[model samples]
Target: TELSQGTWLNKPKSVFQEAGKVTLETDEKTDFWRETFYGFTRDSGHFLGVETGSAFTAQVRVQGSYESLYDQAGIMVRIDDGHWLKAGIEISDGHAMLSSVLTNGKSDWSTAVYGGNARDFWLRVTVEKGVLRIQVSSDKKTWPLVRLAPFPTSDHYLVGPMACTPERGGLKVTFSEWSLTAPLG
Candidate 1:
């Protein structure tokens, strides 16, 4: 399907796109963060986003190996810097952990142990009524809530796959079967 997808700030070194799939490779330590514990604002990250106006649902399968510290790959819903959420798998303390970071002005992080395959997993996000609901699935049939929180609604927002390596770079991730539809919230 034709999609209105593009990058946010800094584009990746290489982004390959084909039928129902996208692969992003970057050497930059791209991350989206605001003043929380670290007083740094990083807008450098690779995002393949469709202009999902108002309410919508974006689901995709992420496949990658979390190699370094803070290496993460997931689906992102972004309005701009300081307002967005990215959730999937992150490498923490030398182990791949499922985590989500939600940013309004600052950012708040939440995590849980992903009991399924870290190399391949599915994430689905539904936004409606000024609320964002994140769901994870091991087989896509059963989606469990990863997070449920309040989100400021916008007339237009960007939704798609995103990846970043905060400490180090070189974690390649592939996103496939990306589907954007009416909000399932």
Candidate 2:
């Protein structure tokens, strides 16, 4: 899909193409959170997405450097701002950690230590029926399961590249080769 075919949530400060790759920068204090441990709902972030079926595969190569707390970049499959799943790398305690947040009515967070350079990675998301599978790769060859859970089934879902800086802004994330592909089968 064309990068412009996807729409944004809180749009961003700046967006452009860098060396043929789509790049997006976050606005100050922008993020997407719906009443978690913090008990606050911050439905703000940058989500450039296309509508897709309940069963399909979406993949993208994401790159970013998360500096401030909660600075993150990745791909998100959203039914809405409230019901969604996001998987990517996040800056945690001064280091990069692979994180995923699955939300039904509330959000639950899961994180794992990333062994590769946090600057670049690949994320593949597959949704079949009501079950969702998340995978990540360093070399884009070895696809390892990141998170799997029961996701809401809908006729159409918003799937695409997503970025946020919950505490601060100015983190540039590149979404390269984003597409909705047929099932791996």
Candidate 3:
């Protein structure tokens, strides 16, 4: 068993890797966002990504100390700087919530209070036929759809674990049980 089978994009300030697990301590003001409501572009989030040239599905378990505003850990599907989707758990409104941001040129976000274990969860994303589907589960089974939307088609994408601390630094996040496979259903 191994963690993400790709390279690091914006490698974090601190990281520890082992069989099936990777932990990262976010850098200051690290995030992935494109000029949206915040009116700023940031591409500094810590991500461990694998290259995929076709339709695929990716899933990972995330656990983190999400105490600060906008602290987030999850999975991301990316084409490039301007096109991507990130979904996972984030600290919002003093609670850990399910959050996703889809970026084309600009990014838009959606979030809801997640009624599961805030410290640990699983995220899954599937991209096929220009559509993206996102799901979450407290356990490995019984995934519930978090989002389903149109996505930009591409010849290749980088999919993997992502974590960010939008306000400050030092949100330790661990990503494990990563898998990449053919799109399901």
Candidate 4:
């Protein structure tokens, strides 16, 4: 996918932007975990997106190694960090935690994590009206619902895939087979 234009609010390092897509190469000192409410907040996620036309379905496949401390990557649908939904694998302790975040105004974040090595994972999001459905998969053949919640849908929204590193940095990620379709049933 091509990137139109983007901005980094408070990123640790500068990101690479090209053709409407942004990529974050692993740097020695990069992270995404910070303190919000759930004890801490990770601030190491890369987002490459475009303005959405209307309610639609966005899906993508992520490939990476979740073998490091707090090494995480996944897909996200965001309208600023204050209001957004993110689903991916968060490395905690010494295992991969499937996690999701649904935020309201002012970074009110809610999170859930599952047991799995979300590497080479696939994610899908369907937005209709003001409702959102998040799904994840390992093989893209079977998808399990991660979360379903309410979000504010306007005329146009920014939606796309995201990747991050929490405790440590230098994680390489590849996002492919991306598509956005009109919402169906």
Candidates ranked by TM-score, best first? 3, 2, 1, 4
lDDT of 2 by residue, 1-185 (tens): 55557777767879886543678888888777778788998778788887886688988889896778889899899998779988899987657899999988899999877888789899999998899999998898899999989998888888888998887689988888776865677
Task: Give stretches of model 2 more than 4 Å off.
Answer: 18-20
Off by over 4 Å in 1: 1-4
On a 0 to 100 scale, what is the lDDT of residue 134 in model 2?
96
TM-score of model number 2: 0.94
User: What's the TM-score of each model vs. the native?
Assistant: 0.93, 0.94, 0.96, 0.76
The candidate scoring highest on lDDT is 3
Query: What CA RMSD would you report for each candidate?
Result: 1.6, 1.5, 1.4, 3.8
Give each model's whole-structure lDDT.
0.83, 0.84, 0.89, 0.66
Q: What is the lDDT of residue 103 in candidate 3?
A: 93
- How well is each residue in 1-185 modelled by candidate 4, as lDDT tens digits? 23334334334364554443445555443434334566754444666665676688888777776667666667777766466767787776555777776766534444455644466778898888999888888777888888888888777667665666654567777666677778876
**Residue 33 error, candidate 3, Å:** 1.3
How many clashes does each candidate structure show, in the order listed?
0, 1, 0, 17
Model 2: weakest 10-residue lDDT segment is 1-10
